[PDB]
Structure of Chitosanase:
Amino acid sequence: GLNKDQKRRAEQLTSIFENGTTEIQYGYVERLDDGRGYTCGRAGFTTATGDALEVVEVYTKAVPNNKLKKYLPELRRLAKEESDDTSNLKGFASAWKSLANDKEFRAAQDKVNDHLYYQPAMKRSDNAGLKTALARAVMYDTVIQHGDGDDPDSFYALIKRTNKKAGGSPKDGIDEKKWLNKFLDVRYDDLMNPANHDTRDEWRESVARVDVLRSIAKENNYNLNGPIHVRSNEYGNFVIK
């Protein structure tokens, strides 16, 4: 996977793309009008998909009868219905934010992020024969935004479309740097014109992350060494140690 420094750098890149800061935002909650209900915490866990539900389940197992327990029935129904409804979540956004610096709540987010996003990203990277830290970091960011579902905008859909355009994966012998450039092209196209119309506005405004990642490739920094300087018209300027 990613070593300690590389994984941190990958996460600070994602943090810029999600929240405009290298400091991971565990307390973030916002309705983006992308069909996903509330988008929450470090991974943008959403109430329509079930992943915010998973955070609250994990937190509730660790800390019974916490301030978010009462939201489980509605979070469960929203996941079942794949629903954008936030009208039955009064107080949820404030309660989530109030736990931004809580050790157990952050740990629950880290656990769900590891299980739903980091480990699947590293597994699919292994399946594709990816060897570079930068390519693995791109996969990690991709699954966080696109999800690991079966839909045409999903992480694995992008991998398969890239493999077809490139004539194979790096495991098949395709040059990994060329493959990753094609992957970034495929992801850009998906963000500009996703199959899911609900997410068009938000994803079109996120395409700059593709160029930030490509700029790392163009510096030939495939090991994701630091410091990294991000210079983005959309996001601003950042240093990542």
In short: Residues 23-116 form one domain. Residues 8 and 23 are 11 Å apart (CA to CA). The two ends are 19 Å apart (CA to CA).
